[PDB]
RNA sequence: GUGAGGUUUU
RNA sequence: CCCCCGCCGUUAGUUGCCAGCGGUUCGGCCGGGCACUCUAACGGGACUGCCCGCGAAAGCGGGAGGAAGGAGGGGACGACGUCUGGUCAGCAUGGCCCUUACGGCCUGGGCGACACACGUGCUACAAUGCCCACUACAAAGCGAUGCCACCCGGCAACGGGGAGCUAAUCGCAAAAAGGUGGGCCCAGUUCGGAUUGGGGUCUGCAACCCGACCCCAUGAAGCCGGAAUCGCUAGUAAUCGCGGAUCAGCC
């Protein structure tokens, strides 16, 4: 079953600048357990996280908190005739985690030759606040609280 | 930036564009430049325009001309069947000839999923 | 300099060496950015010292032997925390309010039968 | 054969392929050891009578 | 002083020499210290239990090499005698080094 | 790569070092 | 990957070379191919177990350092097909 | 106040 | 009740650290320590035990607190029984035939034959990967006809020695991204890759078709896949890194 509270999945108190919120996003950027190649993008790169955004090297994501998180989407449906289980009264932890796993591939899937552009393909989207999670909150997250037909099937 | 060979990889590093010239590889494009003094991290386009033309005779001294040893790929198969050996029809039936398995893996010289009826 | 602190992750034989001096943090023959160079978790080591307004007047070099690299940093976060016996372990108002008093015991789990790499196994076939 | 496969291999041993690294009492030649001589099957029905101490069950 | 390769079967029966030469050599001249531990060389033979119809899930089989050495601080005619005139030949195969 | 003819670890996976990349 | 010692089997090293003493018929029965074919006599026919049965081999002066190991017909592969798949 | 295109016997 | 793990006064002080202060080649090196350090020996070692709420009844939220917590952690462990499931490709045993033989006798071939078709291991779709200066942070089994630093001949695959070891230093091995690196510039491209016929070294009767594949030739396929699968709950995936076991390479 599932009737049990979770674990010590809250990682660790880190030491660089605090900021356990985006160190987990570095854990989303990295693959194959590789360190000192993903943390060089966020920390050791001194020319792409600054000199282009205008200010504020560490807290670029001020714009990438207020209006970028995907929150509200369907869980899972079987043959389940016409439920449309969008609204759901969703959770802030899932709201953060869908951003942390859905704001990743706007730099990996979008390549560029330069070793200073393919990294911080994402930092301009975080500083400006654009990408694939801005139109999605207007497409998917604005079709639940306006009118009246879907289904009584909830849980 | 013209090369010693024929197919130009369009202005890359001297370890890269000079390599896949026929007759040249990793251990010839790596030692053929450190003797002449070119730093292997530089570009073919950023070479000296005299090093463009004087690094061409060094390649064409000993080994046989481009396409001729590629014809010796088909001619060595001819000379091994001096009496019409069994290795000749090991070659000319579309399969690897070392002795790999050919129902699974080593699907290369066979046509990929070409012919079965059932 | 020789203290009670023995922080053993990664089967690292920990011998931590510190006394009141002048420098912030030292290591065996290097200067904290050449031997510890390579992991970002080594840019700020002395968390039990800097957390209690006792930042940088300790020598804090080591003789630690076993395993890899970041368990030495865990032997600073836990090795200094066991090595504060000079700074009076009856001081119970320096490590208690912060979320600090969980000890490093998370070791990598061992390997079993029918198995490649410690709970990775071949799957079902149904034929 | 079943009985005299031991005496079949006791001719002059030639060289370092087709090794006669066989089990002693039965007719096995698989998973023998340079500390036992017996095989993985005969350590089960011989060393678990108490006949061959040393090797035990660890199970940690 | 001298190295003596102590190999016992079980560590209690190896303590029947490592705890008998020592307590038989402390009291009358040419004293002795306790045994330092050599590494127990636990072998690994993790092989299949069943003869034929047993594919995976095999049992661990070890082989424990219990070994120490006792450091005497003076050898003489009343302590080399205590190495070879007392014996409990049930868990002991020792050697004497030079 | 492991399965390559000559890489850094292609000598490790296949057993011996190369005639251009020796031991020392 | 051949070396300075070109090995022929001691069972079959000089018991193929009976021709070079006087001169006899153009056949002699050797067995192996992992042993090197004899370089002393040339031009004649050497009987050998060629993989399937004892059928001879005949050189035509084209071997300088070529290996005889490509002479083994025993897989009489007629062609493709005849599978009866999905089993 | 609510649920199935829906199955065959080895 | 049987151990790993985090874990100590006592710990043996052949791992021994100038940690005091010692002197040194500036490795505790060396002619006393054991104060700080394992292997392996070991007995103490918290228990929702105390408090306040839910309760006639232990289930009882949380606090103190330590090595950890209310089950300290994984692990070690496998009921009465099922499948007339399978084992003579162990052993003994009933039984069919074979004992001038489905036995041995002698060394080439075969299990790696090819056009397929399902899942199991290595596993690149590139600047986040990569032949590339480089030397390290080593958990444990290995190794005296074996490992083989240094010292070699080395474009070397590897001849011939010796250094240390009848077996924790001496040497295994290289721990891997640690590189503060120069670059490979959106590329079907040094990201990536096999089949290939000639030469040079073999440990080995001998490597072909059944040596590792060693610099060489040469590099076909691949930009993340369909009807929804399937190993994974916080030290769990994932590349990376080490040894055996019959062991000469290693398939
Ligand atoms: Mg090309
Ligand atoms: Mg791990
Ligand atoms: Mg039915
Ligand atoms: Mg003490
Ligand atoms: Mg439990
Ligand atoms: Mg069955
Ligand atoms: Mg079944
Ligand atoms: Mg059956
Ligand atoms: Mg293509
Ligand atoms: Mg191996
Ligand atoms: Zn047996």
Domain boundaries defined on chain A: 1-155
**Distance, CA of C76 to CA of C74 (rounded, Å):** 5
Residue C78 domain boundaries:
1-127
**Distance, CA of G16 to CA of A137 (rounded, Å):** 88
Question: Is residue B25 domain-shared with residue B77, that is, in the same domain?
Answer: no
Binding site members of D: 23, 26, 39, 42
CATH topology for D1-60?
Answer: 30s Ribosomal Protein S14; Chain N (4.10.830)
Checking DSSP bridges between strand G57-58 and strand G45-48, what pairing results, if any? antiparallel
Q: How many CB atoms lie within 10 A of CB C51?
A: 16
**Residue B77 near residue B88, CB atoms below 8 Å:** yes
Report which of C127, C113, C48, C109 is spatially closest to residue C81, judged by C-alpha positions.
C48
Cα of C28 vs its chain's centroid, Å? 16
> In this structure, which ligand is nearest to the CA of C2?
4
A33: Cβ contacts below 8 Å, ≥ 6 apart: none
**Distance, CA of B64 to CA of B18 (rounded, Å):** 18
Resolution (A): 3.8
**C-alpha torsion B66→B68→B74→B76, nearest 10:** -120
Domain containing residue E31: CATH number? 3.30.70.600
Give the nucleotide with minimal C1' distance to the Cα of A154.
H2
Question: Is residue B76 domain-shared with residue B65, that is, in the same domain?
Answer: no
Question: Is residue B53 domain-shared with residue B78, that is, in the same domain?
Answer: no
Contact partners for chain C, using 3 or more CB pairs closer than 8 A, are A, E
> In this structure, which ligand is nearest to the CA of F12?
10
Contact partners for chain A, using 3 or more CB pairs closer than 8 A, are C
Q: Interior CA angle at F18 toward F15 and F23, to 5°?
A: 80
Cα of A53 vs its chain's centroid, Å? 20
Question: Is residue B1 domain-shared with residue B59, that is, in the same domain?
Answer: yes
CATH topology for A1-155?
Answer: Ribosomal Protein S7 (1.10.455)
Domain containing residue B39: CATH number? 1.10.8.50
Structure tokens at E21: 């030469």
Residue E25 domain boundaries:
1-98
Question: Is residue B78 domain-shared with residue B28, that is, in the same domain?
Answer: no
**Distance, CA of E46 to CA of A56 (rounded, Å):** 59
For chain C, the domain total comes to 1
Question: Is residue B49 domain-shared with residue B20, that is, in the same domain?
Answer: yes
**Distance, CA of E61 to CA of A31 (rounded, Å):** 38
3-state secondary structure chain G: CCCCCCCCCCCCCCCCCCCCCCCCCCCCEECCCCCCCCCCCCCCEEEEECCCCECCEECCCCCCCCCHHHCCCCCCCCCCCCCCCCC
Checking DSSP bridges between strand E62-63 and strand C61-65, what pairing results, if any? unpaired
Experimental method: cryo-EM
Report which of G34, G67, G31 is spatially closest to residue G48, judged by C-alpha positions.
G31
> Is chain G touching chain B, with at least 3 CB–CB pairs below 8 Å?
yes
Between the CA of B94 and the centroid of ligand 1 the distance, in Å, is 24
* DSSP designation for E61: B
Cα of C36 vs its chain's centroid, Å? 13
CB of C114 within 8 Å of any CB in chain E? yes
Question: Is residue B10 domain-shared with residue B64, that is, in the same domain?
Answer: yes
**Residue C23 near residue C14, CB atoms below 8 Å:** no
A145: Cβ contacts below 8 Å, ≥ 6 apart: A87
Residue B80 domain boundaries:
72-118
Nucleotides of H under 7 A from a protein CB: 1-5
Cα of B38 vs its chain's centroid, Å? 23
Between the CA of E13 and the centroid of ligand 1 the distance, in Å, is 72
Domain containing residue C36: CATH number? 3.30.230.10
* DSSP designation for C71: H
Give the nucleotide with minimal C1' distance to the Cα of A80.
H3
- Distance set, CA A148 to CA A76, A145, A152 (Å): 22, 9, 11
């Amino acid at each position: 079953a599932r009737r049990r509270r979770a674990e010590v999945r809250q990682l660790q108190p880190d030491l660089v600048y605090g900021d356990v919120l985006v160190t987990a996003f570095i854990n989303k950027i990295m693959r194959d357990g590789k360190k000192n190649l993903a943390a060089r993008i966020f920390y050791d790169a001194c020319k792409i996280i600054q000199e282009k955004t205008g200010q504020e090297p560490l807290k670029v994501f001020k714009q990438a908190v207020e209006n970028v998180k995907p929150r509200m989407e369907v869980r899972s449906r079987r043959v389940g005739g016409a439920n449309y289980q969008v609204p759901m009264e969703v959770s802030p932890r899932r709201q953060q985690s869908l951003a942390l796993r859905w704001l990743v591939q706007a730099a990996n899937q979008r390549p560029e030759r330069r070793a200073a552009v393919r990294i911080a393909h994402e930092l301009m989207d975080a500083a400006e606040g654009k990408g694939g999670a801005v139109k999605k909150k207007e497409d998917v997250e604005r079709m639940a609280e306006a009118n009246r037909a879907y289904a009584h099937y909830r849980w | 930036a013209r090369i010693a060979g024929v197919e130009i990889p369009r202005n890359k590093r001297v370890d890269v564009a000079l390599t896949y010239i026929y007759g040249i590889g990793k251990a010839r494009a790596k030692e053929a430049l450190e003797k002449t003094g070119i730093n292997p991290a530089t570009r073919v386009k950023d070479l000296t325009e005299a090093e463009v033309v004087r690094l061409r005779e060094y390649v064409e001294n000993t080994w046989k001309l481009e396409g001729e040893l590629r014809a010796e790929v088909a001619a060595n198969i001819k000379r091994l069947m001096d009496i019409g050996c069994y290795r000749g029809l090991r070659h000319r039936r579309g399969l690897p000839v070392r002795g790999q398995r050919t129902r699974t893996n080593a699907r290369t010289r066979k046509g990929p999923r070409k012919t079965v009826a059932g | 300099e020789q203290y009670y602190g023995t922080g053993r992750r990664k089967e690292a034989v920990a011998r931590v060496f510190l006394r009141p001096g002048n420098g912030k943090v030292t290591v065996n023959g290097q200067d904290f950015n050449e031997y510890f160079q390579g992991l970002v978790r080594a840019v700020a080591a002395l968390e039990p010292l800097r957390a209690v307004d006792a930042l940088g007047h300790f020598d804090a070099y080591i003789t630690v032997r076993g395993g890899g690299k970041s368990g030495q940093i865990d032997a600073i976060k836990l090795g200094i925390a066991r090595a504060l016996v000079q700074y009076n372990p009856d001081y119970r108002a320096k490590l208690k309010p912060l979320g600090f008093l969980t000890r490093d015991a998370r070791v990598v789990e061992r390997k079993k039968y029918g198995k490649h790499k410690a709970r990775r196994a071949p799957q079902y076939s149904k034929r | 054969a079943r009985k005299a496969l031991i005496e079949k291999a006791k001719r002059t041993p030639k060289f370092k392929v087709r090794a006669y690294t066989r089990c002693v009492r039965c007719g096995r030649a698989r998973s023998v050891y340079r500390f036992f001589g017996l095989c993985r099957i005969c350590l089960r029905e011989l060393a678990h009578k108490g006949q061959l101490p040393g090797v035990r069950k660890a199970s940690w | 002083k001298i190295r003596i390769k102590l190999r016992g079967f079980d560590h209690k029966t190896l303590d029947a020499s490592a705890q008998k030469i020592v307590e038989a050599a402390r009291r009358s001249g040419a004293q002795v210290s306790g045994p330092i531990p050599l590494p127990t060389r636990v072998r690994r033979f993790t092989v299949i239990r069943g003869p034929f119809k047993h594919k995976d899930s095999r049992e661990h089989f070890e082989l424990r090499t219990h070994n120490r050495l006792v450091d005497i601080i003076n050898p003489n005619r009343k302590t080399i005698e205590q190495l070879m005139t007392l014996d409990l030949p049930t868990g002991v195969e020792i050697e004497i080094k030079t | 790569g492991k399965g390559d003819r000559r890489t850094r670890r292609g000598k490790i996976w296949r057993g011996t070092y190369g005639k251009y990349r020796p031991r020392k | 990957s051949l070396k300075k010692g070109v090995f022929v089997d001691d069972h079959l090293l000089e018991k193929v070379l009976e021709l070079n003493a006087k001169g006899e018929k153009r056949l002699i029965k050797t067995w192996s191919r992992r042993s090197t074919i004899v370089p002393e006599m040339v031009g004649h026919t050497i009987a050998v177990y060629n993989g399937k049965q004892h059928v001879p081999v005949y050189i035509t002066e084209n071997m300088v350092g070529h290996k005889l190991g490509e002479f083994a017909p025993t897989r009489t592969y007629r062609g493709h097909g005849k599978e009866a798949k999905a089993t």
